[PDB]
């Protein structure tokens, strides 16, 4: 088998997929397992004056595996507003729809040299890409498997497990996992009561990220 | 037929059940269509010291329909803790499990003397009530059509669009409304644009809250 496809989407905008994919990255190239990080579609950038965009964190680490790596080697549609993909793509690049068919194939080509490709998304798995795909068709596409990343706050139950009922009602291999803050024990009091009983009613738990980077290597790494 | 019963929802607690169960209230009543508000659990409270909870908010509105009512004829499991009601009962009244049995009964008993029963719920509709049950399996119970309010900013797309797909995979009559809040304008360069897309394109339109009190009364009321 060729290398192994990671998927990471949200609960939420900055509920911490950049912070976490890293995270990973670096547990498991540490573990001598060779990971890249890919940012396909990123708004709310502006390249010409402003050097961290998530593409540009990726890079930067992705530069301690391939000096040669640049940054439009690892994020290929990029536009400024603050917005879905699609509505950004229909106002700025009007001409140019994104088409996850080649992203498809520029992901899949990072599997020959890489171990494990860590592929963020955008937005969360309902935010829309083209007329007829959204995060989640991208990643179905990819047939890559998915670690959802949930914020820790109050409402992480109902955002949980309405992501839950989206991704079990289709066809991947997907964990969640939520981003635990430093600073934050309201959670424990507030929140994780709840996520220990769905845990033992359900086949695919709930993880805390930070508790979890073996489980979730173990989880992207397993099988073809 | 006797009353029609409207369930009140939300993608996330503080998006504006009660300021728009209230607004759809008061313009049903003005219109001769004599409406009750019910807040049958409530977490985050405290009514020793406090009389601004949503059910006294409620209770204020429908004693211009009936001064005898009091608080516990249109509240009936209030909690301290600031949770998902399941974790809240169990806390602090391990031997009083929610009975939506009871409360479906309670409900529709309103049914005789109003012409719409609106019942706001807390929480989201993944939010677990009882070991289980949740509060769609609440309001699928009671046979209510549903109206779930929608928070105005960035984030609006997938949080309609996750509640959009658990709620057509049941068997229930729902809308999705914005709140859109004053001072927002935001909403119509950033979101409308995706929103205007999707309504083309579904139907069941999402709709925003403030221009709809009509179509909305009229969804509540509509058939048998
Ligand atoms: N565990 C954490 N501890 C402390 N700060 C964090 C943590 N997770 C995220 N953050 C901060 O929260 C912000 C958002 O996190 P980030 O990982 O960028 O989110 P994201 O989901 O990738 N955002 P986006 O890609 O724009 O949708 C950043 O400033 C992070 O540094
Ligand atoms: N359209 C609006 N314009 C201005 N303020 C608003 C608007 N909608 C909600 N608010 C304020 O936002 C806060 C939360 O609204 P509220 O209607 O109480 O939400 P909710 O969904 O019922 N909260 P909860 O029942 O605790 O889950 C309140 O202080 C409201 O006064
Ligand atoms: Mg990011
Ligand atoms: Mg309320």
Same mark, same amino acid.
């Given at each position: 088998f060729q290398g192994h496809m990671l998927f990471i989407s949200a609960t939420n905008t900055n509920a911490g997929k950049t912070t976490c994919a890293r995270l990973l990255a670096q547990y498991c190239n540490?573990? !001598? #397992? /060779? +990971?890249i990080l890919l940012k396909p579609i990123? +708004? !709310? #950038?502006?390249?010409? *004056?402003?050097?961290?965009?998530?593409?540009?964190?990726?890079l930067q680490d992705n530069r301690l595996l391939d000096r040669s790596l640049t940054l439009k080697d690892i994020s290929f549609y990029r536009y400024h507003k603050?917005?879905?993909?699609? *509505? $950004?793509?229909?106002?700025? &690049?009007? =001409?140019?729809?994104?088409?996850? &068919?080649?992203?498809?194939?520029?992901?899949?080509?990072? +599997? /020959? +040299?890489?171990?494990? #490709?860590? #592929?963020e998304g955008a937005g969360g798995l309902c935010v829309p890409i083209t007329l007829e795909e959204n995060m989640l068709d991208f990643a179905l596409k990819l047939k890559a498997k998915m670690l959802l990343i949930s914020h820790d706050n109050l409402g992480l139950i109902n955002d949980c497990l309405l992501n839950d009922f989206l991704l079990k009602s289709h066809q991947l291999d997907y964990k969640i996992a939520?981003?635990? /803050? !430093?600073? =934050?024990? $309201?959670?424990?009091?507030?929140?994780?009561?709840? *996520?220990?009983?769905? =845990?033992?009613?359900?086949? =695919?738990? *709930?993880?805390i990220f930070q508790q979890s980077l073996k489980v979730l290597m173990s989880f992207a790494l397993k099988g073809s």
């Open positions: 540490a573990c !001598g #397992v /060779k +990971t990123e +708004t !709310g #950038v502006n390249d010409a *004056i402003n050097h961290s965009s998530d593409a540009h964190l990726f603050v917005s879905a993909p699609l *509505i $950004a793509q229909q106002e700025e &690049d009007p =001409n140019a729809p994104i088409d996850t &068919d080649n992203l498809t194939q520029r992901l899949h080509n990072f +599997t /020959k +040299t890489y171990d494990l #490709v860590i #592929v939520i981003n635990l /803050k !430093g600073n =934050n024990t $309201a959670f424990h009091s507030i929140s994780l009561p709840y *996520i220990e009983l769905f =845990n033992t009613r359900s086949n =695919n738990p *709930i993880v």
